Design an enzyme around this catalytic site. Structure first.
Site, short mmCIF file in Angstrom:
data_model
loop_
_atom_site.label_atom_id
_atom_site.label_comp_id
_atom_site.label_asym_id
_atom_site.label_seq_id
_atom_site.Cartn_x
_atom_site.Cartn_y
_atom_site.Cartn_z
N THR A 103 0.81 -1.22 0.00
CA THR A 103 0.00 0.00 0.00
C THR A 103 0.85 1.28 0.00
OG1 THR A 103 -0.30 0.01 2.42
CG2 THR A 103 -1.95 -1.15 1.11
N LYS A 106 -4.67 -2.37 16.27
CA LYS A 106 -5.67 -2.00 15.27
C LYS A 106 -5.97 -3.21 14.39
CE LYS A 106 -5.98 0.22 10.92
NZ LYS A 106 -5.51 -0.32 9.61
N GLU A 128 -12.40 -1.65 14.63
CA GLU A 128 -12.70 -0.92 13.39
C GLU A 128 -13.62 -1.70 12.43
OE1 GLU A 128 -9.26 0.17 11.10
OE2 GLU A 128 -10.46 0.96 9.44
N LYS A 186 -13.40 2.62 16.11
CA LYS A 186 -12.97 3.39 14.93
C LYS A 186 -13.96 3.15 13.79
CE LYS A 186 -8.96 3.99 11.77
NZ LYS A 186 -7.49 3.78 11.57
N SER A 192 -11.36 8.53 8.13
CA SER A 192 -11.74 9.55 7.15
C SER A 192 -12.24 8.94 5.84
CB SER A 192 -10.58 10.52 6.87
OG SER A 192 -9.52 9.89 6.16
N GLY A 193 -12.04 7.63 5.67
CA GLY A 193 -12.51 6.93 4.49
C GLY A 193 -11.94 7.58 3.25
N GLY A 194 -12.82 8.00 2.35
CA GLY A 194 -12.40 8.63 1.09
C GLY A 194 -12.58 10.14 1.03
N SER A 202 -8.69 9.07 13.79
CA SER A 202 -7.58 8.18 13.49
C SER A 202 -7.36 8.23 11.99
CB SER A 202 -7.83 6.74 13.93
OG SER A 202 -6.71 5.92 13.61
N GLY A 253 -5.05 8.71 8.43
CA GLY A 253 -3.81 8.43 7.72
C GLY A 253 -3.70 9.34 6.51
#
Lengths: 349, 358, 363, 351
Positions: C43, C150, C193, C235, C277-279, C305, C307
């Protein structure tokens, strides 16, 4: 366009909104509920505890005594009525309900039809009443009732695995079905899974059982599509067993009760209205106070007391109609005592 | 002591009686007669034969049914509405005694009908738990040895029906009913009818019936119900009423037997099928197809009403004159379904056209 | 033994319960949230290609040094989720990366799930792997400095195909519950999550309905597996309309329907929710988190949380260059503070409030 | 025309059909399964009792001894293997699985990765192995394996409430997941929820717990979409606990076992393959016989024995190459003894 189908569907906006406002009013700051929902049989045991027989005239006079008290609505938001009392008039022509409307108190109604044994259990209890419930609610709403009460009973007997799974779910599912039926018919359901204090179990064991039961109750609520915002919970306080286990103190009763609720009751629930059980009028007030002394909570932590508000009221009434002004003075005292416990500002001496 | 978190056992005495009654109810070559129509339901039946829905006519009609000589050969039990269980014929004899004379076990409908489940699109909950224990005691004294409780589920795939709420309200309701019965010495017929309404395929009905029954039997073990003293009354697995892909009896038979073999444990003495909207012939032909599929782990028999009574009323018209001729028709249909129990009912595809030579 | 109630999960030792609870509280400290730096080799190679840079061990170490080496970052970030490699990694000058976090007072965390696989008999619905040997990995991760974990599971909303199905919801619910209880036993706070993907044309109300059902189910599994809510974090996805839906949803709705869903499902013993935050864009992730907290004070900490929502513009203004490190760390601090202010319901930086507004003629 | 969506979808007709045929063959009339799926960990202990070094040579020789037995296929339908043995050859160059093919026996494979504690329980056990299971199955099918085994363990201690709900559901759900992954990858799963005989509990209590456990196991199986027609159950027989010193005769072991299954196992399940637990070779045969003497059942009631088939085979061998022939006679003797138990026709009575 398409809803997620495999999910209970919503209450229509109009009723959802009314249920939520009633529920909030029922747990107003500094207020709680008066449990006066005693059936003809359960009144006969308390009346004849102080003599003078259990007639329709005496019952009406006693409920007039309670609901006729001036200023009681400052400490009491709602009154749970038995069916008879809901349609009853005073020896003066006036509906009992109007004297609650005078003092600005919300009338409620007991809708359960008592307890029966679950087969294949050691006398564990199932609560009756779903048959024709929807129709009774329509009639009770017309009569002025804006909220309901349904009592279920679980037992802690650790040696015999009580409460058992069957007991927990029969209770949980029964309450869930009741609560959804009320909300459909515009009544705020008080969900009451009372775990009896009977036995020699410790306070920690009661905490474990109450947490397990409540987790299971709320699951059934969600299952059945109950709007938590328009509902109230009426649980037992977390305490050691009556038969004792190092006779605990109010500090503990308060902590383990608040903890249990914080792990099980989501904040959409407007408030918890505690039941006094076998506690003394005073300890019901001291313990409620200990619960609220533990800071401001995500929900209103208040009371739904019957015996704890009425005991010394009866024993200082004795039937004779000269005591009404005087009997109501004892009622107000207790109502204010528990009102102050809500705020965490009730000391003692 | 023993393992505490499991339902307690039934007393040896009542468990044994329930098991015996359940076995007798699905005797070889026999099934149940559903004569349990209420006043409101039986009124609609008398309209078709332009007859007054009075107590006299009802009593006479049930006399017609239960008074049939030789009905006991093909019928093991008769489900009754409350009125009929205490009713007498016009000549004084109690109609429960008519059943006894032909050795047919009386049963009693104990549910109080259907109501909407809130937060569902008109999905149904069955009422009747309130005071049920007490009614059973009274019905057992009256002669009743088994009970019936009907719940209704609907298949509508686009609307996610049967929803989970629906399946569990039904499952738990039946489980509570069955447990209250057995405690009070009555064999409960557990009836989770999935309606044939809609255009759904037979495969979809198989999937839904399997899911429903799996859930029903779970509630049953949950509530401590003795399967050996109970009976299941399910819908046959069929395509929906408005399905263009029109199926034949051989498939009804296969997908019904399959569904049951994946869901019903063999402690259950037998399954007593409901007819639904099937014609009299179809109800017989389909029950026959089910049994033509080898011998089963349980008795696969019938609990029919409309499928046994339709022509009986139509060859009676309420007239005491035509009673003999109506009995004729009941015994004909009773025997037709008795033969379908065995898988040996024809009642009217190589069928070769032969010839010559040797 | 003593005759206590036997058919319920047994408590954790007093010692570990207390540590888990303190870590969980510190992870949702006032004005703080979590930095999701737990990208896998596969990733992270995808993001390094957006800056036309190569994916080697040297570049990965340099980038994580860039993030965790930022001075004062611990004022806005309480914890950092790491991928196993990074947890046992030194920087250019031989300094362990975990020590970089210790300096900045940030709590190191570790991703412990082993990715997703299909649930058979479903239409490609996802099950998360990782329970095999999990207890042992946790012991090793705690020694390495990790104090929380996580585990990601993925559900999909597709109303026509009845997704998420009951099988999907319970595989996810039970998996997370098992993961949680393994972690807490081994002294790690589990971040639970259950991400419901925003994919599809569904409305916000439908997402609210599905999120509520899923969370109700997740928390039931937690309680059954004996998870201490006080020493755990949730989450979840924010409640939003699908990506393919119309062309709107106001942030005040995203905020309302998210807060409502949580109030009906998450008991207050849970110290805090740390949103994914997803997308969303970096700004949208900040504006939406701000809308959630603008809705008065909550029974739990409603924080982040993030990234991509924290890293997107840092990767951009860096491009693998040793020189840009200083400059990129400013963009990190900018976003970290933006979300810190969103924690308080006090973020603007772009508009402000969607109200009032105009040209005032004064007199 | 849309299908009902909230239900697990079917297996492709192709694989569903293959699973069902394998499952049927595995419970063929007069046949059962040989459990030779011992780990290195556990076969070490058996080799220690016969004073043999636990080497790869000895293990291969012993499995050669078992699978090389002529006419074993008459009494045994399948053999569960340990991963090593599935890919192993004898001291000769011949693949072990080819010896199974010679006797027309179906090879199987143990796929669980052993037991771990469930936290918040008093050492109740959870079975590991779901991670990468799909991939291992593809590999095992290529190697010749046509069915799988996953062992879970529950304990009866009435005073401590064992098995607690957490234990029952972790077990039930783990088996369901394992089962569903196997069937997807063309392996018949043997679902094994062993309730240990440990403790002083009566046979009635065991019946009550086994019934509860199995009801819950099969519920998880439907949930997860497992095709019962292509699966097998490997339960404990219902017996009294090891202590207590009550009678617990074989007629009762037979009755309460048959009853429990009839209340819990639907007939779509082709057969039950009983585990012996800590029963003696003979007891395992006498008790299996008592079960089948209770008339023809809706499923095949047969065996999946290891110890109960190997104990005397091992001891009457002592690692010695001469004693190969002699030990193989002891194996066949036991294989036939339990084959006769299938029919209810083993040692024509004692009452």
């Amino acid at each position: 366009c398409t809803e997620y189908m495999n999910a209970p569907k919503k209450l229509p906006a109009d009723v959802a909104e009314e249920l939520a406002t009633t529920a909030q009013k029922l747990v107003q700051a500094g207020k709680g509920i008066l449990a006066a929902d005693e059936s003809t049989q359960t009144i006969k045991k308390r009346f004849d505890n102080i003599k003078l027989e259990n007639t329709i005239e005496n019952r009406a006079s006693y409920r007039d005594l309670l609901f006729g008290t001036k200023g009681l609505g400052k400490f009491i938001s709602g009154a749970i009525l038995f069916e008879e009392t809901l349609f009853q008039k005073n020896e003066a022509g006036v509906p009992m309900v109007n004297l609650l409307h005078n003092e600005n108190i919300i009338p409620g109604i007991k809708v359960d039809k008592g307890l029966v044994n679950i087969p294949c259990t050691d006398e564990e209890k199932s609560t009756q009443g779903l048959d024709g419930l929807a129709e009774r609610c329509k009639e009770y709403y017309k009569a002025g009732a804006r909220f309901a009460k349904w009592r279920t009973v679980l037992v802690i007997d650790t040696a015999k695995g009580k409460p058992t799974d069957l007991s927990i779910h029969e209770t949980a599912w029964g309450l869930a079905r009741y609560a959804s039926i009320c909300q459909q018919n515009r009544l705020v359901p008080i969900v009451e899974p009372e775990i009896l204090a009977d036995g020699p179990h410790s306070i920690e064991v009661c905490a474990v059982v109450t947490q397990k039961v409540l987790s299971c109750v709320f699951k059934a609520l969600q299952e059945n599509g109950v709007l938590l915002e328009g509902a109230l919970l009426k649980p037992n306080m977390v305490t050691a067993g009556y038969e004792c286990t190092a006779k605990t103190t109010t500090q503990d009763v308060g902590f383990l009760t608040v903890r249990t609720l914080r792990r099980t009751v989501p904040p959409a629930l407007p408030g918890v209205v505690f039941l006094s059980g076998g506690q003394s009028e005073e300890e019901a007030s001291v313990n409620l106070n200990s619960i609220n002394a533990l800071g401001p909570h995500p929900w209103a932590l208040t009371f739904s007391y019957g015996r704890a508000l009425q005991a010394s009221v009866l024993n200082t009434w004795q039937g004779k109609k000269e005591n009404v002004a005087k009997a109501r003075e004892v009622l107000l005292q207790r109502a204010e005592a528990n009102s102050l416990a809500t705020y965490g500002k009730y000391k003692g001496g």
